């Protein structure tokens, strides 16, 4: 399952909604997954056990 939120460019974190609560996780440091655009959509995928702060559109 995918849980969405928004990323912080300054802190390279993703704040996502799951189980009624907001959770802050670091984004990856990888070039094409880190938070490059402030408040970009991000998601935690609990199937793949991944975070991506450059989700596609
Ligand atoms: Cl690194
Ligand atoms: Cl990457
Ligand atoms: Cl990850
Ligand atoms: Na980084």
mmCIF file with all atom_site columns, C-alpha atoms and ligand atoms in Angstrom:
data_model
loop_
_atom_site.group_PDB
_atom_site.id
_atom_site.type_symbol
_atom_site.label_atom_id
_atom_site.label_alt_id
_atom_site.label_comp_id
_atom_site.label_asym_id
_atom_site.label_entity_id
_atom_site.label_seq_id
_atom_site.pdbx_PDB_ins_code
_atom_site.Cartn_x
_atom_site.Cartn_y
_atom_site.Cartn_z
_atom_site.occupancy
_atom_site.B_iso_or_equiv
_atom_site.pdbx_formal_charge
_atom_site.auth_seq_id
_atom_site.auth_comp_id
_atom_site.auth_asym_id
_atom_site.auth_atom_id
_atom_site.pdbx_PDB_model_num
ATOM   1  C  CA  . UNK A 1 1  ? 0.000  0.000  0.000   1.00 0.00 ? 1  UNK A CA  1
ATOM   2  C  CA  . UNK A 1 2  ? 1.064  3.593  -0.690  1.00 0.00 ? 2  UNK A CA  1
ATOM   3  C  CA  . UNK A 1 3  ? 0.749  6.394  1.832   1.00 0.00 ? 3  UNK A CA  1
ATOM   4  C  CA  . UNK A 1 4  ? 1.084  9.915  0.517   1.00 0.00 ? 4  UNK A CA  1
ATOM   5  C  CA  . UNK A 1 5  ? 2.307  13.208 1.798   1.00 0.00 ? 5  UNK A CA  1
ATOM   6  C  CA  . UNK A 1 6  ? 4.607  16.127 1.117   1.00 0.00 ? 6  UNK A CA  1
ATOM   7  C  CA  . UNK A 1 7  ? 8.378  16.510 1.300   1.00 0.00 ? 7  UNK A CA  1
ATOM   8  C  CA  . UNK A 1 8  ? 10.661 19.118 2.858   1.00 0.00 ? 8  UNK A CA  1
ATOM   9  C  CA  . UNK A 1 9  ? 13.476 20.231 0.581   1.00 0.00 ? 9  UNK A CA  1
ATOM   10 C  CA  . UNK A 1 10 ? 15.510 21.695 3.443   1.00 0.00 ? 10 UNK A CA  1
ATOM   11 C  CA  . UNK A 1 11 ? 15.317 18.590 5.639   1.00 0.00 ? 11 UNK A CA  1
ATOM   12 C  CA  . UNK A 1 12 ? 14.882 15.911 2.970   1.00 0.00 ? 12 UNK A CA  1
ATOM   13 C  CA  . UNK A 1 13 ? 11.894 14.348 4.742   1.00 0.00 ? 13 UNK A CA  1
ATOM   14 C  CA  . UNK A 1 14 ? 8.486  13.037 3.715   1.00 0.00 ? 14 UNK A CA  1
ATOM   15 C  CA  . UNK A 1 15 ? 5.470  13.586 5.988   1.00 0.00 ? 15 UNK A CA  1
ATOM   16 C  CA  . UNK A 1 16 ? 2.838  10.988 5.077   1.00 0.00 ? 16 UNK A CA  1
ATOM   17 C  CA  . UNK A 1 17 ? -0.601 10.032 6.356   1.00 0.00 ? 17 UNK A CA  1
ATOM   18 C  CA  . UNK A 1 18 ? -1.229 6.485  7.640   1.00 0.00 ? 18 UNK A CA  1
ATOM   19 C  CA  . UNK A 1 19 ? -3.646 5.055  10.241  1.00 0.00 ? 19 UNK A CA  1
ATOM   20 C  CA  . UNK A 1 20 ? -5.019 8.513  10.973  1.00 0.00 ? 20 UNK A CA  1
ATOM   21 C  CA  . UNK A 1 21 ? -1.642 9.969  11.851  1.00 0.00 ? 21 UNK A CA  1
ATOM   22 C  CA  . UNK A 1 22 ? 1.162  11.862 10.169  1.00 0.00 ? 22 UNK A CA  1
ATOM   23 C  CA  . UNK A 1 23 ? 4.603  10.222 10.070  1.00 0.00 ? 23 UNK A CA  1
ATOM   24 C  CA  . UNK A 1 24 ? 7.884  11.953 9.167   1.00 0.00 ? 24 UNK A CA  1
ATOM   25 C  CA  . UNK A 1 25 ? 10.527 9.809  7.455   1.00 0.00 ? 25 UNK A CA  1
ATOM   26 C  CA  . UNK A 1 26 ? 13.748 10.739 5.758   1.00 0.00 ? 26 UNK A CA  1
ATOM   27 C  CA  . UNK A 1 27 ? 13.601 10.631 1.988   1.00 0.00 ? 27 UNK A CA  1
ATOM   28 C  CA  . UNK A 1 28 ? 16.340 8.660  0.245   1.00 0.00 ? 28 UNK A CA  1
ATOM   29 C  CA  . UNK A 1 29 ? 19.582 10.457 -0.486  1.00 0.00 ? 29 UNK A CA  1
ATOM   30 C  CA  . UNK A 1 30 ? 19.479 9.051  -4.046  1.00 0.00 ? 30 UNK A CA  1
ATOM   31 C  CA  . UNK A 1 31 ? 19.511 11.653 -6.837  1.00 0.00 ? 31 UNK A CA  1
ATOM   32 C  CA  . UNK A 1 32 ? 16.155 10.712 -8.361  1.00 0.00 ? 32 UNK A CA  1
ATOM   33 C  CA  . UNK A 1 33 ? 14.315 10.021 -5.094  1.00 0.00 ? 33 UNK A CA  1
ATOM   34 C  CA  . UNK A 1 34 ? 15.367 12.815 -2.712  1.00 0.00 ? 34 UNK A CA  1
ATOM   35 C  CA  . UNK A 1 35 ? 13.213 15.895 -2.110  1.00 0.00 ? 35 UNK A CA  1
ATOM   36 C  CA  . UNK A 1 36 ? 14.299 18.378 -4.805  1.00 0.00 ? 36 UNK A CA  1
ATOM   37 C  CA  . UNK A 1 37 ? 11.135 20.499 -4.870  1.00 0.00 ? 37 UNK A CA  1
ATOM   38 C  CA  . UNK A 1 38 ? 9.747  21.780 -1.602  1.00 0.00 ? 38 UNK A CA  1
ATOM   39 C  CA  . UNK A 1 39 ? 6.360  20.238 -0.709  1.00 0.00 ? 39 UNK A CA  1
ATOM   40 C  CA  . UNK A 1 40 ? 6.544  17.792 -3.641  1.00 0.00 ? 40 UNK A CA  1
ATOM   41 C  CA  . UNK A 1 41 ? 4.305  14.788 -3.261  1.00 0.00 ? 41 UNK A CA  1
ATOM   42 C  CA  . UNK A 1 42 ? 6.038  11.838 -1.651  1.00 0.00 ? 42 UNK A CA  1
ATOM   43 C  CA  . UNK A 1 43 ? 5.009  8.385  -0.652  1.00 0.00 ? 43 UNK A CA  1
ATOM   44 C  CA  . UNK A 1 44 ? 5.861  5.545  1.640   1.00 0.00 ? 44 UNK A CA  1
ATOM   45 C  CA  . UNK A 1 45 ? 5.181  2.178  0.032   1.00 0.00 ? 45 UNK A CA  1
ATOM   46 C  CA  . UNK A 1 46 ? 4.791  -0.522 2.676   1.00 0.00 ? 46 UNK A CA  1
ATOM   47 C  CA  . UNK A 1 47 ? 4.843  -3.312 0.073   1.00 0.00 ? 47 UNK A CA  1
ATOM   48 C  CA  . UNK A 1 48 ? 8.203  -2.361 -1.393  1.00 0.00 ? 48 UNK A CA  1
ATOM   49 C  CA  . UNK A 1 49 ? 9.328  -0.804 1.972   1.00 0.00 ? 49 UNK A CA  1
ATOM   50 C  CA  . UNK A 1 50 ? 10.448 2.356  0.187   1.00 0.00 ? 50 UNK A CA  1
ATOM   51 C  CA  . UNK A 1 51 ? 10.144 6.108  0.297   1.00 0.00 ? 51 UNK A CA  1
ATOM   52 C  CA  . UNK A 1 52 ? 10.209 8.292  -2.824  1.00 0.00 ? 52 UNK A CA  1
ATOM   53 C  CA  . UNK A 1 53 ? 10.135 12.108 -2.716  1.00 0.00 ? 53 UNK A CA  1
ATOM   54 C  CA  . UNK A 1 54 ? 10.033 12.404 -6.532  1.00 0.00 ? 54 UNK A CA  1
ATOM   55 C  CA  . UNK A 1 55 ? 6.852  10.528 -7.239  1.00 0.00 ? 55 UNK A CA  1
ATOM   56 C  CA  . UNK A 1 56 ? 5.751  10.610 -10.895 1.00 0.00 ? 56 UNK A CA  1
ATOM   57 C  CA  . UNK A 1 57 ? 2.773  12.525 -12.375 1.00 0.00 ? 57 UNK A CA  1
HETATM 58 CL CL1 . LIG B 2 .  ? 24.304 9.105  0.932   1.00 0.00 ? 1  LIG B CL1 1
HETATM 59 CL CL1 . LIG B 2 .  ? 17.658 7.360  -7.778  1.00 0.00 ? 2  LIG B CL1 1
HETATM 60 CL CL1 . LIG B 2 .  ? 13.694 4.090  1.126   1.00 0.00 ? 3  LIG B CL1 1
HETATM 61 NA NA1 . LIG B 2 .  ? 20.155 14.368 0.416   1.00 0.00 ? 4  LIG B NA1 1
#
